[PDB]
Amino acid sequence: LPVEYLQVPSASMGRDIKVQFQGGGPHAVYLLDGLRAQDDYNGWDINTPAFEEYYQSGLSVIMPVGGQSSFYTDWYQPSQSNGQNYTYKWETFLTREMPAWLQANKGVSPTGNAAVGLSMSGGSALILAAYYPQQFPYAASLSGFLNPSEGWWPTLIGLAMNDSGGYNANSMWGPSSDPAWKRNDPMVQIPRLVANNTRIWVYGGNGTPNIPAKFLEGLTLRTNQTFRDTYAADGGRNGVFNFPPNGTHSWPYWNEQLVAMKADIQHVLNG
């Protein structure tokens, strides 16, 4: 398999970002990582056969490497405690710096692509489509945080980020009253997704991959149901909602969904 590892300079983050890449078409699937993203390889390549599954699909595959607990967003400041000596600017990287580099050097189109995320980056994918519809007419969220600004979620996200590399949610989007929380909330941005006619693919699993597991499961179930209902209520007509009883929040089932959506992405992006 013709998989490459690239070093893509980020002016905004003052460092080179590693990117795993497989070509095969002008349009690409951006495969975003989970909460515990490592600096050597993207979680999709560590845990799944994603590259082989999309080989000769007519689509390129882009796996950015790094950004533990980053939510693939532009942060207010360096994270307080874990000694981060720069500010995460991953929205700037994914929407400006990386597509410019791939276009200039490889001919990958900056427009007409898919953003696919899981866990932490499920919401990221929807937000990227909400604000950059020309770049991402297609977005998939697999076990994402669909309402991060509401209820228990700012606290739970803060706890998760701290457990994953000691990152500080306050440095990212401020206190939960800060406008950045609603700005980056897929539920709140459903009207953008509808206006843009974004093709969205939303998966939620069940079960358990402190606070009792059943309580957390109840929160996840309710928020997922609210997102689906609100999308329909707001005029949404271009979504796929997959909530199978036996689905889990795990790489094997996230891969099952990535395979299931391949025909969907091919038809939407390549006709």
- Strand order across the beta sheet in which 15-22 lies: 4-10, 15-22, 60-64, 28-31, 114-118, 138-142, 199-203, 239-242
94 assigned ligand-binding residue = no
Six-digit token string for 158: 């803060």
**How many structural domains are present in the chain?**
1
- CB-count burial class (<10 Å; 0-12, 13-18, 19+) for 231: buried
Cα–Cα–Cα angle for 167, 124, 95, nearest 5°? 105
**Resolution in units of Å:** 1.5
Q: Mind giving me the DSSP string for 92-111? A: HIIIIIHHHHHHHHH---SS
Tell me which H or E stretch contains 8.
strand 4-10
249 assigned ligand-binding residue = yes
CATH number where 259 lies: 3.40.50.1820
Contact 104, 261 (CB under 8 A): no
> In the PDB record, what is the listed experimental method?
X-ray
What CA–CA distance (Å, rounded) separates 123 from 126? 5
35 assigned ligand-binding residue = yes
Q: 120 lies in which domain range? A: 1-271
What CA–CA distance (Å, rounded) separates 258 from 271? 19
147 assigned ligand-binding residue = yes
Residue with tokens 């109840």: 218
**How many Cβ atoms from other residues are within 10 Å of residue 83's Cβ?**
8
251 assigned ligand-binding residue = yes
226 assigned ligand-binding residue = yes
Residues designated catalytic: 119, 217, 249
139: closest CA among 264, 271, 234, 259? 264
